[PDB]
Every structure is written in structure tokens, then in C-alpha cells.
Write a protein that binds this DNA or RNA. Structure first.
Lengths: 119, 121, 181, 31, 35, 54, 238, 40, 49, 95, 234, 148
RNA sequence: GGCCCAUUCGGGUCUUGUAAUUGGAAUGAGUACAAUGUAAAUACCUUAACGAGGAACAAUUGGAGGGCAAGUCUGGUGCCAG
């Protein structure tokens, strides 16, 4: 919930650690009918495989739980991803400042807290 | 003062040797001194590339005369030896010509490099 | 039952479909890029409008704002990965300077025509729809596939396609068989 | 600065041993 | 063009061209039929 | 010089080969303030090697 | 098309000093100031006149942007017999020789060039035409060659530079007559490739106007050239 | 003479299309001067 | 729809070279003159008043 | 509203008033008197053409839609089949 | 350049199988055996890597991701094989089962290098690569730069500029045909024409702290990597 | 000599394929007044209408008609002289603007015209490829700009 | 000869038309041998053979104009008009 997508790419450029890119053709969902797979949805699928390898059996999707996990996840694509990078997070409105803000109890509240920080 | 003038700096040569490479892949590249002259004679050359260490240099100083008559940019790289691989070809090249094609896949960085070459001139 | 779902349209009909300037605008865009219908032009205009509206909203904000800086740089990073914006236009005003023709130029059928693999835009579309084009290793039959730069160079003919090294198609082998017979 | 505060905020949101690691060790020993 | 083909006056050069003569003989016959 | 045979199947190859080198010598002569014969002397020598092989 | 035996009829153009050769094709031609030779390998007409053999040169509109303007149909061409012309950006005698032909022996042509390499051939051309005065000097500094140019009626500038308007103005202020001619050739890509051609031409016609040049005309040079025009203007000092 | 006849052939076709357009701009013009003076 | 519109666009291309001149690669080979002829008394010129 | 709020109204074909007209495809030949079923009020309706006039007969169901000035109604639909389908030889009227 | 990968018996050099690349541009440019394994990895000019199981004489999988030709290839005991893309100026490390790649870029510029100093040649291409370690590898560039890499960092951890020196300046008697001595000297343009030696070879002994570089300077240079694997010396 | 002005090369028929962002917009005298009336002040009111950066231009004439208006129309003058508003100088004797405004778009097919005077609107409607922008209702409206 | 513009008269412009003949390639729907899949099975993925010139392997909808008879009707100032 706290994570804001646009922020973590700055970590990526500023991490200085590689990113483990996949193959050009291995990313397209289905012959191009579904656009290039977004970065997040590649992070979800590997959880399935990393989940699938240990359990020793695949996970089937219930007919109900099916009906709210592919279309909009491939229609947010058709609305929002054009080429495997999302154009949707921006039309959305969010208060990222709370995620940036040092809202925790360990926050500058008096002149002495910030002075101790500067030490 | 020098006959080989202007000479691209270390950086500018790299972008030029780049656009040279994809051109060889896309059949937009005519290389060698006489082909440069022919592409110049027909006026299909958007800009030419020549080498400053040609042995002797004098065998490619016709091309500056041809281009400046017609307003085509030209620029020099330190090495004819380096200009070879960018052409994708097993021998040194002292002069090569990228041709005019508004229908080419690689237009954008050509006009980017072609933007810089006139600034150098 | 269980919760319903959010889905939306990828396009919007123009404010006035009937001004002549518009009509011949779709005419030449279609003809040069070889589209099927005006539906694709309304599609592409729709996202271009969304992108420019976001860019304008980010312009309205004062310099150095967390909002403007974060989201504007994210617009531009993604717009440069798609290849639409060059590396030297890393600014949001130049996002506001964008046009539909650049997106259409990023459509795969343009690249298949453009690299020399096809001799007409319609031939490029036929080749794509006919399982002859591979971006890297993977076969695409959607002309509306937009191409990245790293993906731009990896456009080749399919290993399975007859022109890319596979056996001749049905017509060629049929002709050879009747010639032998 | 703004990036660091987010990381510090994230770390706030997020004797020593891991239950999964103990399981993985049995899995590895079986392996 | 060759020296032999050259003529002092334009019309003679048009006389040497066989295609123009063949082209036109057809047309003059066609028009006279209508007339 | 193909109207007076100035440079003149195997014979034609030499005529073109000499034509290529004659073009270079003009470039050196034209774009040198004080042209020398050092390059001309050698550029004749390869033609002599060219002639012997054919 | 225009082959050796083919015979043509020479008749005058609307502009003085310009001529048309009819036939199966129509050619723009100018009488040769130096008969018996071609300057850039152009094509030539020889006419028998009482008999003296007068000679006429073919003007290739693709090579010469001014000739493309004539093909474009310029209403007014200040370059005319008995008129002083200042040619800026004279790469060689490809066009200046034709301009030298139009002005005639009574006229002169002040050819200005910067790059030394094209200058050498231009000087070699200049000897063959006693009326051409070659100025191998930067046009950005008219004070450099004020020593060499007398008062001029018209200025032709084909310099392909971003700062052409400044070059045109300084030369116009120093050299051009009041009510004198201004005729420029503009390419959009050099001045500004970022924006379309039409906005560029609007910007250039604007810059001429602060400099007290009244612009009269503009011609895009299609089908002979993309993204060109020739703007014709009058210098209004008063 | 075949080309001059061609001009007269497309001449007649245009003016029929032309007389159609003016008729629309006549009838619609009368309508506006009824709606305008309806206020007055 | 694709074949129809292709003929429509190319037709429209045939239509514009009638109304105005368009570049076709420039000169190709030796200059063979003005094929359509030269009109002495005609100007196509867009005049600044 | 012409139909009192509905977009369509059925009626009863009483008599084809234009049968005796000499001129083929006259404006009159397409006029038919119709009884509105919901209130019984007689009205006049348009049939698309004299060819379609063959299809309409007396005591058949006819649906009327908004359109010899004053005849505001057109016959769009008859006896289980739309006229244009019958007129295009796409259907036969059920009896 | 025949677009074939043929295998011989070691004893008699007798051919036992031919494996076509099945690509017009699939000119094989480098071969590397997985250490103590029958796995072969082949880098081919069609921008792709071909991996074979020689015990079977069969093709297994193909790798995609490289921006230009794959000139060189190096592998160690595990299957993490490293590559260099020539004009790509990028080095790529591959997980064959997972099929992902780690992409490594140089990203140095003479502009900043000179200012920090206050002849540096921009890299035109990476030419060679050898795996010092399963977590470290070295590359050689066409500007004479030897760069040390680690999987942790994208950028080089340490680089050795102009390792093999600068090429001899062209003779003044050959630069131009002008008679006067000084005229030909101006054609040399001082030291602006001088270019560095190319790194034609670069081999590191596996799992060691030393490696060897090669060129036509006339000498093989032996380098030693620091114990901390953060730098190397001659 | 007969003169037949060439159709601009920026036109594929009646599409102007030259006007692209950023635009050039000429301001007419009435437009400043109506903008003040509907409180749609100049620069962003476009930015919402067009979603692109434009360059407002006021001619020597238009700056002059604004200034014949008098003390009742002072607000229009200060808005007219905003530094973001560049000026298009004029070299014709008359101070009449409506012939001034149209005549520039006759030459160069690179401008939009901002106007609410019905006197000046239809003149732009015959000439092809001249987008026509006006203030109506609560914000500006652009008629002949398909890129919108 | 094609076309553009023009209430008006006419003016502007050039490779255009076929309602002509002809050649070799590609492949999708269909016709379908299999394996897989699965409690079994359907389905999905993959995959042998065949499969196009009227490629008749024959999508629709709406609108705008024509023109033709030893044809029919009506009105008028021949041969007209509706």
C-alpha cells in the first residue's frame, strides 16, 4: 500500500545494482494480442513459479477468483500499458507525500530532534 | 589551418561511427572514395564521412570541394582504420557516404548527427 | 456473487467527426501508415490526449515539486523507452510537443516496412498477420504492436517462416510436386 | 532526501532465525 | 546523337524517327475515316 | 581518354587499373601546393606489378 | 531530350537578360559571356548571327536556386542589364556565371565567399568574366571588404547559415541602394530544423522587416527543392 | 477539340451540383431570417 | 476496408500533384529541360503587398 | 407525441385509397387508411412504394412510425414481417 | 563464417556431426565450453547465442538481448556465461535455465575524466571478455581500456586506461606528398591523430588473481588482481 | 504579367500539415475584450483549450485598435502588452486590422487567428488550413484544428 | 486523356486509364493423423497430411446520380413538358 511505483524506478537508477532483464520475446503475453508484460506483473508471476516449484503442484484458479484477476489485469494493460510500461499510475490520484514523509514517531518535532539528526 | 579540418573530437566520432554501423545494416551506406563522389554527383548524399589519417591525405581532398559546392556537411575521424568496422567491412575505409532517405528506419539519429556536423563546420 | 470488475474503452469518438480537415487527416494517416479504420486513429489520439493532459497538469505545478518532478520524469523516462522521445528531448514541454505520427511510427508494421523486410506498408501488415515476423524470438501477428529500441533492432524473420530458413510453403511444395509428377 | 525518507518510512513499515529457512534446510538435506 | 541522324532543320530529325511516323500514320487514317 | 586510347578483356583491365591510379595522381597534384613525384613514382610501380601478373 | 542534332528556337523571356529555348522541351538559357566553354559542364546553344557564332548557356534550375525561382515565376527580378549585383554565398561559378550573364558587360557581379577551397575555382572563373569581382571573405563582417565593393543596386544572398538575416542586413545597410533590391534564398533546416518550414519563413520575413527591407514576394521552389523559398524585397531606408 | 468538349461536359455537371448548393443556402437563409425576427 | 482506402490515398496523391508541384527525388540523370513547357507571361507568385 | 408516448403504433388496414390512381408511383398510390388499435382513430399512412403496396392487404396488422402533405405516418412493418425485408425478397408475409 | 558448428574426434580429427546455425547471419564468433561439462555455448554474428549439448549433438536454447554482434564468450563451472556486444559497449551475463540476463555498461566519458585530472579515448567497442570469477569478470575495449566488473555493480569497479599504450604516430613522409618537411608535419595534427592499441586478447586463469592481455604492441602483459578484488596491477 | 498565387506546400488540400505544437496565435481586438468579459485570461485559457504551448502575437494594428478603444478599455491594453505576448510589426499604410490579420494567413500557413468579430470569421473559413479560435460560453473554442 | 478551382466567363496542372492479358510465391479459415491434458472426459497448448484466381473458400448497411423501348399515362402554342 505504501509503495508508489514511480518512486522505486528512481531507486533502480540510483541503486547502481543490476536489474535482471528478461529476453525481448519472452516478455510478450500472447503473440502480441496482450502487450508486453509490465514490470509488476512479471514480479507477480515469478511468485507463482517460486511458489509453484516448492509446492510441487501447480495452482489452479477458481472459476470465481478467475473472474477478477485476468481481464482487468489485461484491461488495465489495454487502458494503461502501451509497450510494457504503465501509463495508468498518473491519471490516478494519490498522496505520495505521506509515503515520502517521515511520518513515523521518529520525526523532527522540536528544535532538539533536528539538531541531534544533524550530528 | 590543417587540410583535415574540421576533425571530430573523441566523443563526436563515436556517434558518427554509430550511425555508420546501422546504415551498413540498412543498406543506406556507400563506402570508398569514388562511391562518395558518385553519391555526391547524383546529390543523394546527406553527409559524407572521411578519415584524417589517409595515406596520403591528398587522395580524398576532392570530396570537400564537391560538398561545399552543394552544401552537404562533411567531417573527419582520426582513423581510417577505425572507420572500417563501423562500415562492417573487412578492410580500411578512408571515405564513406550516408545517403538521403526520408524512408529510413534510422533517420532520427542521422539528423541528430547531421545537426552536430554543421555546428562543427 | 463476487465483486464486479473495472474495464474501460481504449478510444473516444472525436468531438465532431465531420469537419473536412479531420476527414482528410485520417485519410493521409491511414494511407501512409496503412491502418484498417479510423478506430485506431481515435485510439491513438486518445492516449496522446491523456499523456499531454498529464504533462500539462504537471507543467501547471511549480518547479521542484515532488509531484511535478517525480511524475514528469516518469512520463519522460517511459516515453523515451517507447522510442517516441529521443534522448536529447528529456523535457516535458517536448512531451507537449508530441504528435500522433510518432506513435504511429512506433507501430510494428511501420518497422517491418521500414527496415526493408517489406516493400509496402500493406505488405508489412500482411507479413505480420501471416506469422513471418519475430521480435527477437517471439512471433507477433498484431500490426498495432509498438516497438522499443532494443526491440526495434531485434525485428527479424521467423525461424518457422519459409523466408527465414524453414521449408517452402504449401504453394511452393505443391508446385514442385506437380512439376515432378 | 525525499527518496531516503521513503526508504526510512519503508524500513519502519517492514534469537534470530527464519521458519522458512529451517524448512528449506530440511528440504535441502532431503536434497 | 550520331552525325548521320543530325539534320539542319528540326523536321528532318522528326523524319528519321520511325516511331513518330508509325504512330502518326495510324492517326491520320483513323481521322480520315471519321471525316 | 577513351576516344583517343590514352590509357590503352585482359587489356581492358589494365586500362581501367591505370585509370584508377591516374585519378589519384591528379588529386595529389591538384591539392598539393608543391606536388612531388615520390607518390607518382611508387604509384607507377604497382601498375608495373599489376602488368606483370596479367 | 536535348540531343546534339536537335535544333531549338531561342526567344526572349519576360525578364531582361533571360531567354527561352523551345523544342520538344523548353529550356531556360542565358547568353554566354565567354563563348566556347562551359563553367560547370552545363549545356550550351550556339546560334549563327550575321556570320558571328553567338553562344548561349543552359541554366539548370535544380543546380541554381535563382533559376528555380524563374521557373517558379518571380514577378520581379532586380538582376537585369546594367545593374550592380552583390552575390553573397558564391560557392562557385555555377550560378554566379549565369548572374554575370544576366547583368552583361556593362554590369558587374560582386561574388562573396568564405571557404577557401571553392574560392579557387571561383577566382579561376572570375578571370574569364571581367565583370565578376570575387570576394573570398566572411560575409558576417562587411567592413572587411568595404574596400572592394562600390555602391550596389541589388543583393543576392544564398548563404546557408542560421544568422543569414544579420549578414543580409549589414551588407544591405553598407552597400544596398535605397529602394534597392533584396532577394534571398532560405532553407529551413539550417536555421531551425526543430519547427516546420512555414513558421521559419514567417520568422525570416519578420527579421527582414526590422532591418528596413520591405519584402515583396515569396516563392517555394518545388518541385525542384524541398523546404526552400526565394523572398524578394525592397530596401526602404527612408 | 475533344478537350474543349470535355470542359463543357464537366461544366454542365458542376453547375447542376452548383445550383444544388445555392438552393440550400437560399432555403436555410430564409429560415434564419424567420428565427431572427421571431425575437423581434 | 484496407484495399479501398489504399486506392483512395494513392488517388489523392494523384490529385495533389495536379493542384501543386511535389518533389520526386529531384533531378534524375541528365537535365532534359522543362517537359511541360515554359510560360513567359505567367507568374505563380505569392505577393507581399 | 404523435403516438402518445410510444415510438411505434399498430393499426388495421381498412382500404387502399390510391388503388384507382392512373399514374404509377404517384404520391397518392402509397396512401392507406389505418385504424389505430389503441384508440380506434382512423389515420392515413405511407407505404414505401407501389411495389410494397402489393404486400399490404385489408385486415392485416400494420405497425406505424413517424414520417400529399399531412400524412405523418409510414408503414414500416406488417403481419409479422417488415416491409423492406419483403420488398427485398428476404421474407414472405405469414398468413 | 560458414554458419556451421562441426565437431571432430580428438584422436583422428575425424568429423562426426555438422550442426548448421540455420541463419544467414549466424556466423559463429566465439565458443566456450562449460568447465567440466559437455555444455557448449556459441556466440554468432546474428546477435544471438547458441548453446549445444555435444554429447547429444543437439541444440538446446537460444539467448536474446544483445544490441550488436556477439564477438566473444566465456564460461566457468556454473552456467553463468558472460558476453560482450562490440559496438553495444555492453557486457551481458546469462542464466540459461532462468533465461534472464544481467546487463553491464561502462558509462565513462573523457569530459569528466579530464576535469578530475585538472590522452583519454572514448570506448568505441568492447573487444574481449574473460571470467576471473563466478562473481567477477574482466573486459577489454577498443580504446585500450581493461575494466574489472562485479555482478553487484553495473558500472566498472576498476579500469586500466590505455593498457597496451598508444600506436606509433604515422610517418611524416607518408601523411602527405608535399615536398617541404614542415608542411607534412602539420598533417600529423600533433597528437590528435594518435589512437590506442586494441585489446585483441584477454584471458584470465579460472579462479585465480592473475590474467593476461594481448595485442600487437609486441608483448603479453600479465596483471595481478588485488586480494580484495577491487583493483589490479601490472 | 499574370499572377496566380501558388497553393502553400504546407497543405494537403485543406489540411495544414505545418501547424504543430507549439502554435502561433494572432490576437484580434475584440478577442481581448470578450476574454475579459468571460474572465478567460489569455495564456492558460488557450492551454486548457489546446493542451499545447502557443505564442500569442499582437500586431502593430491590433495594439492600435485596442488603444483607440479609450479609457473604458484600459484593462485590454495592459493584458495586450504582456511580455509573453510577442509583437508582429506591420509595414502597410492602413491601420485597418481585419485585412491586416487575414492577409498574413494568406501568405504563411502557420498561424491560428483569435477572434469573435463575425466580420472577420468567414474570411478565414474560405481560406484552407487556417485554424480559427474564438471565445464562447466559458472558455475558448477551436473550430478548424483537427489536432484536438 | 486524367483531375483541380471558378454564381458568371473560363482558368490552373501532368503520366494517366483499362470495364486488357499474364507469371511465380505466402498463408488463414476449413478437411484433420496425434500426443498432451484430465478421476475419466471436454477444453487449452503444441503438432503430421490436405487446403486459393470468380482465390464462387462468393461480409452487410445507407445515400447520390444516371441512361435505355416500335412500352404506358397526363398536360400544352408541331418535333415539347411532367
Amino acid at each position: 500500500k505504501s509503495r508508489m511505483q514511480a518512486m522505486e524506478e528512481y531507486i533502480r537508477e540510483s541503486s547502481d545494482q543490476p536489474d535482471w532483464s528478461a529476453s525481448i520475446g519472452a516478455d510478450i503475453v500472447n503473440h502480441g494480442r496482450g502487450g508486453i508484460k509490465s514490470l509488476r506483473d512479471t514480479e507477480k508471476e515469478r511468485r507463482v513459479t517460486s511458489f509453484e516449484e516448492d509446492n510441487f503442484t501447480r495452482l489452479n484458479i477458481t472459476n470465481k477468483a478467475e473472474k477478477r484477476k485476468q481481464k482487468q489485469r489485461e484491461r488495465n494493460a489495454r487502458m494503461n500499458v502501451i509497450g510494457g510500461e504503465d501509463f495508468g499510475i498518473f491519471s490516478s490520484k494519490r498522496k505520495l507525500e505521506d509515503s515520502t514523509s517521515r511520518r513515523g514517531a521518529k520525526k523532527t518535532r522540536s528544535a532538539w530532534d533536528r539538531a541531534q539528526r544533524r550530528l | 589551418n590543417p587540410k583535415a579540418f574540421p576533425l571530430a573530437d573523441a566523443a563526436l566520432t563515436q556517434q558518427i561511427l554509430d550511425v555508420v554501423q546501422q546504415a551498413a545494416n540498412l543498406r543506406q551506406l556507400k563506402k570508398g572514395a569514388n562511391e562518395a563522389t558518385k553519391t555526391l554527383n547524383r546529390g543523394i548524399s546527406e553527409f559524407i564521412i572521411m578519415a584524417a589519417d589517409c595515406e596520403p591525405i591528398e587522395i580524398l581532398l576532392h570530396l570537400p570541394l564537391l560538398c561545399e559546392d552543394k552544401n552537404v556537411p562533411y567531417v573527419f575521424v582520426p582513423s581510417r582504420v577505425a572507420l572500417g568496422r563501423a562500415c562492417g567491412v573487412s578492410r580500411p575505409v578512408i571515405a564513406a557516404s550516408i545517403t538521403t532517405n526520408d524512408a529510413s528506419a534510422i533517420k532520427t539519429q542521422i539528423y541528430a548527427v547531421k545537426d552536430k556536423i554543421e555546428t562543427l563546420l | 456473487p463476487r465483486a464486479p470488475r473495472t474495464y474501460s474503452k481504449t478510444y473516444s469518438t472525436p468531438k465532431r467527426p465531420y469537419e473536412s480537415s479531420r476527414l482528410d487527416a485520417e485519410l493521409k494517416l491511414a494511407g501512409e501508415f496503412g491502418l484498417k479504420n479510423k478506430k485506431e486513429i481515435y485510439r491513438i489520439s486518445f492516449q496522446l490526449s491523456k499523456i499531454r493532459r498529464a504533462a500539462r497538469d504537471l507543467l501547471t505545478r511549480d518547479e521542484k515539486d515532488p509531484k511535478r518532478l517525480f511524475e514528469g520524469n516518469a512520463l519522460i523516462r517511459r516515453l523515451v523507452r517507447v522510442g517516441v522521445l529521443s534522448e536529447d528531448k528529456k523535457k516535458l514541454d517536448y512531451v507537449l510537443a508530441l504528435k500522433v505520427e510518432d506513435f504511429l511510427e512506433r507501430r510494428l508494421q511501420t518497422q517491418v516496412y521500414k527496415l526493408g523486410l517489406a516493400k509496402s506498408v500493406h505488405h508489412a501488415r500482411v507479413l505480420i498477420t501471416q506469422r513471418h515476423i519475430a521480435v527477437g524470438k517471439q512471433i507477433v501477428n498484431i500490426p498495432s504492436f509498438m516497438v522499443r529500441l532494443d526491440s526495434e533492432k531485434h525485428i527479424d524473420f521467423a525461424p518457422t517462416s519459409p523466408f527465414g530458413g524453414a521449408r517452402p510453403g504449401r504453394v511452393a511444395r505443391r508446385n514442385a510436386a506437380r512439376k515432378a509428377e | 532526501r525525499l527518496a531516503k525518507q521513503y526508504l526510512e518510512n519503508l524500513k519502519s513499515e517492514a534469537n534470530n532465525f527464519d521458519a522458512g529457512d529451517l524448512d528449506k534446510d530440511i528440504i535441502a538435506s532431503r536434497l | 546523337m550520331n552525325r548521320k541522324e543530325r539534320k539542319s532543320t528540326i523536321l528532318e530529325t522528326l523524319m528519321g524517327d520511325e516511331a513518330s511516323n508509325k504512330y502518326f500514320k495510324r492517326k491520320y487514317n483513323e481521322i480520315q475515316e471519321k471525316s | 581518354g577513351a576516344e583517343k586510347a590514352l590509357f590503352r578483356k585482359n587489356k581492358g583491365r589494365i586500362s581501367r587499373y591505370l585509370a584508377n591510379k591516374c585519378s589519384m595522381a591528379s588529386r595529389i597534384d591538384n591539392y598539393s601546393e608543391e606536388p612531388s613525384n615520390v607518390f607518382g613514382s611508387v604509384l607507377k610501380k604497382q601498375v608495373e606489378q599489376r602488368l606483370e601478373f596479367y | 531530350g536535348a540531343r546534339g542534332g536537335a535544333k531549338v528556337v531561342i526567344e526572349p523571356h519576360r525578364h531582361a537578360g533571360v531567354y527561352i529555348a523551345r523544342g520538344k522541351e523548353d529550356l531556360l538559357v542565358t547568353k554566354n559571356m565567354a563563348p566556347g566553354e562551359s563553367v560547370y559542364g552545363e549545356k550550351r546553344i550556339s546560334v549563327e548571327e550575321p556570320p558571328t557564332k553567338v553562344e548561349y548557356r543552359v541554366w539548370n534550375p535544380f543546380r541554381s536556386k535563382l533559376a528555380a525561382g524563374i521557373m517558379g515565376g518571380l514577378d520581379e527580378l532586380f538582376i537585369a542589364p546594367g545593374k550592380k549585383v552583390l552575390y553573397l554565398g558564391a560557392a562557385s561559378g555555377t550560378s554566379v556565371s549565369h548572374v554575370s550573364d544576366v547583368v552583361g558587360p556593362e554590369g558587374v557581379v560582386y561574388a562573396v565567399e568564405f571557404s577557401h577551397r571553392p574560392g579557387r575555382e571561383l577566382i579561376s572563373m572570375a578571370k574569364k568574366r571581367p565583370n565578376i569581382i570575387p570576394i573570398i571573405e566572411d560575409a558576417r563582417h562587411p567592413q572587411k571588404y568595404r574596400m572592394l565593393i562600390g555602391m550596389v543596386d541589388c543583393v543576392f544572398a544564398d548563404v546557408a547559415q542560421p544568422d543569414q538575416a544579420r549578414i543580409i542586413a549589414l551588407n544591405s545597410h553598407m552597400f544596398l541602394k535605397d529602394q534597392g533590391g533584396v532577394v534571398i534564398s532560405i532553407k529551413a533546416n539550417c536555421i531551425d530544423s526543430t519547427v516546420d518550414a512555414e513558421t521559419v519563413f514567417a520568422r525570416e520575413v519578420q527579421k527582414l522587416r526590422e532591418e528596413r527591407i520591405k519584402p515583396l514576394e515569396q516563392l517555394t521552389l518545388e518541385p525542384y527543392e524541398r523546404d526552400h523559398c526565394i523572398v524578394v524585397g525592397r530596401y526602404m531606408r527612408s | 477539340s475533344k478537350r474543349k468538349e470535355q470542359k463543357a461536359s464537366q461544366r454542365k455537371e458542376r453547375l447542376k451540383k452548383l445550383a444544388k448548393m445555392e438552393e440550400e443556402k437560399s432555403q436555410r437563409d430564409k429560415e434564419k431570417k424567420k428565427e431572427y425576427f421571431a425575437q423581434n | 476496408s484496407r484495399v479501398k482506402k489504399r486506392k483512395k490515398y494513392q488517388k489523392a496523391q494523384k490529385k495533389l500533384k495536379s493542384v501543386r508541384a511535389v518533389y520526386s527525388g529531384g533531378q534524375s540523370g541528365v537535365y532534359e529541360g522543362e517537359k511541360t513547357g515554359i510560360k513567359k507571361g505567367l507568374t505563380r507568385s505569392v505577393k507581399f503587398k | 407525441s404523435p403516438f402518445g408516448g410510444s415510438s411505434h403504433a399498430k393499426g388495421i388496414v381498412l382500404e387502399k385509397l390510391g388503388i384507382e390512381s392512373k399514374q404509377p408511383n404517384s404520391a397518392i398510390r402509397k396512401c392507406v387508411r389505418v385504424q389505430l388499435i389503441k384508440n380506434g382513430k382512423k389515420v392515413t399512412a405511407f407505404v414505401p412504394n407501389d411495389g410494397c403496396l402489393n404486400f399490404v392487404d385489408e385486415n392485416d396488422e400494420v405497425l406505424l412510425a413517424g414520417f400529399i402533405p399531412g400524412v405523418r405516418f409510414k408503414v414500416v412493418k406488417v403481419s409479422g414481417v417488415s416491409l423492406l425485408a419483403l420488398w427485398k425478397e428476404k421474407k414472405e408475409k405469414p398468413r | 563464417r560458414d554458419r556451421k558448428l562441426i565437431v571432430w574426434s580428438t584422436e583422428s580429427l575425424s568429423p562426426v556431426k555438422v550442426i548448421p546455425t540455420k541463419d544467414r547471419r549466424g556466423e559463429v564468433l566465439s565458443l566456450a565450453f562449460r568447465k567440466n561439462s559437455d555444455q557448449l555455448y556459441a556466440s554468432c554474428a546474428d546477435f544471438k547465442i547458441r548453446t549445444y549439448s555435444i554429447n547429444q549433438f543437439s541444440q538446446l536454447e537460444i539467448l536474446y538481448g544483445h544490441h550488436d554482434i556477439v564477438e566473444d564468450i566465456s564460461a566457468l563451472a556454473m552456467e553463468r556465461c558472460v558476453t560482450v556486444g562490440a559496438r553495444d559497449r555492453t557486457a551481458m551475463l546469462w542464466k540459461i535455465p532462468d533465461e534472464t540476463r544481467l546487463t553491464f555498461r561502462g558509462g565513462d566519458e573523457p569530459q569528466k575524466l579530464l576535469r578530475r585530472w585538472m590522452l583519454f579515448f572514448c570506448e568505441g567497442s568492447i573487444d574481449v571478455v574473460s571470467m576471473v570469477d563466478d562473481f567477477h569478470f574482466i573486459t577489454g575495449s577498443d580504446n585500450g581500456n581493461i575494466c574489472l566488473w562485479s555482478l553487484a555493480k553495473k558500472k566498472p569497479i576498476f579500469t586500466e586506461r590505455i593498457a597496451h599504450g598508444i600506436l606509433p604516430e604515422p610517418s611524416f613522409n607518408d601523411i602527405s606528398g608535399e615536398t617541404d618537411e614542415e608542411l607534412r608535419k602539420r598533417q600529423l595534427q600533433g597528437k590528435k591523430l594518435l589512437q590506442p592499441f586494441w585489446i585483441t586478447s584477454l584471458y584470465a586463469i579460472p579462479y585465480s588473481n592473475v590474467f593476461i592481455s594481448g595485442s600487437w604492441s609486441g608483448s603479453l602483459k600479465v596483471w595481478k588482481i588485488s586480494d580484495n578484488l577491487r583493483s589490479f596491477e601490472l | 504579367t499574370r499572377n496566380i498565387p501558388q497553393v502553400s506546400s504546407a497543405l494537403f488540400f485543406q489540411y495544414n500539415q505545418a501547424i504543430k505544437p507549439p502554435y502561433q496565435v494572432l490576437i484580434d481586438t475584440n478577442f481581448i475584450n470578450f476574454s475579459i468579459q468571460k474572465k478567460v485570461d489569455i495564456v492558460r485559457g488557450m492551454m486548457d483549450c489546446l493542451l499545447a504551448k502557443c505564442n500569442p502575437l499582437i500586431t502593430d494594428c491590433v495594439m492600435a485598435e485596442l488603444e483607440k478603444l479609450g479609457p473604458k478599455y484600459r484593462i485590454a491594453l495592459k493584458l495586450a502588452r504582456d511580455p509573453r505576448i510577442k509583437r508582429l510589426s506591420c509595414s502597410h499604410k492602413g491601420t485597418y486590422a481585419d485585412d491586416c490579420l487575414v492577409h498574413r494567413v494568406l501568405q504563411h500557413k502557420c498561424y491560428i487567428v483569435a477572434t469573435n468579430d463575425a466580420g472577420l470569421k468567414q474570411r478565414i473559413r474560405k481560406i484552407p488550413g487556417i485554424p480559427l479560435m474564438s471565445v464562447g460560453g466559458h472558455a475558448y473554442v477551436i473550430e478548424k484544428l483537427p489536432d484536438v
